[PDB]
Design a protein around this ligand. Structure first.
Ligand code: HEM
Ligand SMILES: [Cl-]
Length: 154
């Protein structure tokens, strides 16, 4: 499929690396959203509950657990849908479509997350976050953002 960003070898390397990573999906989902709130503290106001809290208060907060999981599981579905490009495209476009109802949401907001996902992958995988994996994730997460953006424009 010409639409899919990765070669067959890099695709299998992705699914292998992600499935060991998805063992701590809730933990990594929390660290991803916290990194969004650390780097871009304006994003905290879209979730009014998370404004007053320290980083460790959120990690244990149940409303943060649900929000963190809802942001990491589309990426987990995306890796699962790597052979089904058409289902992969539908799911990522639907994700970008959800944000239209959110007041004052911008198209450029989605790109802030890929910096935070690589952070989540770095801390969770640790020594499993290899030189080869850093390259593969860089191309892949950038591509998912493009398709999430497509759902927001359309
Ligand atoms: C590109 C990565 C992102 C993914 C995969 C993602 C995923 C999702 C999903 C699946 C939903 C729907 C939740 C549901 O009803 O089940 C959602 C809603 C939402 N997302 Fe995102 N999102 C992303 C980026 C962002 C960014 C950058 C922000 C800005 C802080 C954001 C803020 C929100 C808000 C405020 C909602 C609605 C809150 C609610 O009523 O639940 N998201 N997101
Ligand atoms: Cl398909």
């Amino acid at each position: 499929d010409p639409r899919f960003p990765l070669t067959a070898r890099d695709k299998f390397s992705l699914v292998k690396s992600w499935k060991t990573f998805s063992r701590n999906l809730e933990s990594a989902g929390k660290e991803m959203l916290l990194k969004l709130f650390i780097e871009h503290p304006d994003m905290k106001d879209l979730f009014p509950k998370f404004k007053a809290k320290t980083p460790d208060q959120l990690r244990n907060d149940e409303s943060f657990e649900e929000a963190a999981l809802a942001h990491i599981t589309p990426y987990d579905q995306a890796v699962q849908d790597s052979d089904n490009v058409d289902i992969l495209l539908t799911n990522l476009k639907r994700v970008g479509r959800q944000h239209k109802t959110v007041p004052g949401f911008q198209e450029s907001y989605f790109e802030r997350m890929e910096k935070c996902l690589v952070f989540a992958l770095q801390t969770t995988l640790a020594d499993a976050y290899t030189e080869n994996m850093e390259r593969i994730y860089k191309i892949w997460i950038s591509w998912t953002t493009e398709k999430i953006r497509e759902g927001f424009r359309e």
